[PDB]
Design a protein around this motif. Structure first.
Motif, mmCIF file in Angstrom:
data_model
loop_
_atom_site.group_PDB
_atom_site.id
_atom_site.type_symbol
_atom_site.label_atom_id
_atom_site.label_comp_id
_atom_site.label_asym_id
_atom_site.label_seq_id
_atom_site.Cartn_x
_atom_site.Cartn_y
_atom_site.Cartn_z
ATOM 1 N N UNK A 294 42.958 -29.684 71.041
ATOM 2 C CA UNK A 294 41.995 -30.658 70.553
ATOM 3 C C UNK A 294 40.748 -30.004 69.979
ATOM 4 N N UNK A 295 40.356 -28.851 70.514
ATOM 5 C CA UNK A 295 39.218 -28.127 69.945
ATOM 6 C C UNK A 295 39.562 -27.452 68.618
ATOM 7 N N UNK A 296 40.741 -26.836 68.555
ATOM 8 C CA UNK A 296 41.233 -26.196 67.337
ATOM 9 C C UNK A 296 41.391 -27.159 66.171
ATOM 10 N N UNK B 252 43.107 -25.884 60.755
ATOM 11 C CA UNK B 252 43.207 -27.292 60.392
ATOM 12 C C UNK B 252 44.585 -28.015 60.531
ATOM 13 N N UNK B 253 44.578 -29.331 60.321
ATOM 14 C CA UNK B 253 44.954 -30.302 61.353
ATOM 15 C C UNK B 253 46.442 -30.609 61.482
ATOM 16 N N UNK B 254 46.881 -30.835 62.722
ATOM 17 C CA UNK B 254 48.197 -31.407 63.013
ATOM 18 C C UNK B 254 48.070 -32.860 63.449
ATOM 19 N N UNK B 255 46.909 -33.225 63.993
ATOM 20 C CA UNK B 255 46.729 -34.580 64.532
ATOM 21 C C UNK B 255 46.793 -34.685 66.051
ATOM 22 N N UNK B 256 45.905 -35.498 66.629
ATOM 23 C CA UNK B 256 45.970 -35.852 68.051
ATOM 24 C C UNK B 256 47.293 -36.522 68.399
ATOM 25 N N UNK C 173 54.431 -24.307 73.950
ATOM 26 C CA UNK C 173 53.697 -23.429 73.043
ATOM 27 C C UNK C 173 53.214 -24.183 71.793
ATOM 28 N N UNK C 174 53.873 -25.295 71.471
ATOM 29 C CA UNK C 174 53.455 -26.142 70.357
ATOM 30 C C UNK C 174 52.283 -27.079 70.654
ATOM 31 N N UNK C 175 51.830 -27.131 71.907
ATOM 32 C CA UNK C 175 50.768 -28.068 72.297
ATOM 33 C C UNK C 175 49.505 -27.703 71.565
ATOM 34 N N UNK C 176 49.107 -26.440 71.673
ATOM 35 C CA UNK C 176 47.756 -26.074 71.285
ATOM 36 C C UNK C 176 47.662 -25.900 69.775
#
Length: 119
Positions: free
Chosen positions: A62-64, A68-72, A115-118
């Motif tokens: 969420x900080x990363x 740039x973005x993958x989405x919440x 590992x894909x979470x962050x």
């Protein structure tokens, strides 16, 4: 001409990543142990590590996003699939026959989600 709080933030992300790498090493070893032993005692230790990783990886993820973005949405969808898998693993460990290689596969899937979470 880089600013201090920018660098601090990057270093914060770096250290958090490093802590996650160290936790994943434990998770790998425990997931392997669980595949070999197949006890609820080893399950307990596995899920306590995985649950700790998820917490820390979501916080980093969420900080990363704000750097740039993958989405919440995506991050949350991965966390939800991890939960699904953990419950399915519990079942497989609790069931009467109990195959080490299938258990290995299940933990390797989880790690793949983890590992894909962050990022």
């Amino acid at each position: 001409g880089v600013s201090f709080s920018e660098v601090m933030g990057k270093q914060r992300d770096e250290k958090a990543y490093e802590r996650l790498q160290a936790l994943m090493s434990k998770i790998d070893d425990q997931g392997k142990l669980l595949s070999e032993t197949r006890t609820i005692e080893e399950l307990r230790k596995y899920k306590e590590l995985v649950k700790e990783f998820v917490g820390d990886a979501v916080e980093l993820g969420l900080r990363l996003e704000e750097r740039n973005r993958r989405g919440r949405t995506k991050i949350y969808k991965i966390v939800k699939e991890v939960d699904r898998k953990l419950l399915d693993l519990t079942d497989a460990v609790l069931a009467k026959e109990k195959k080490g290689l299938d258990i290995l596969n299940m933990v390797g899937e989880i790690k793949g989600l983890l590992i894909n979470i962050y990022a």
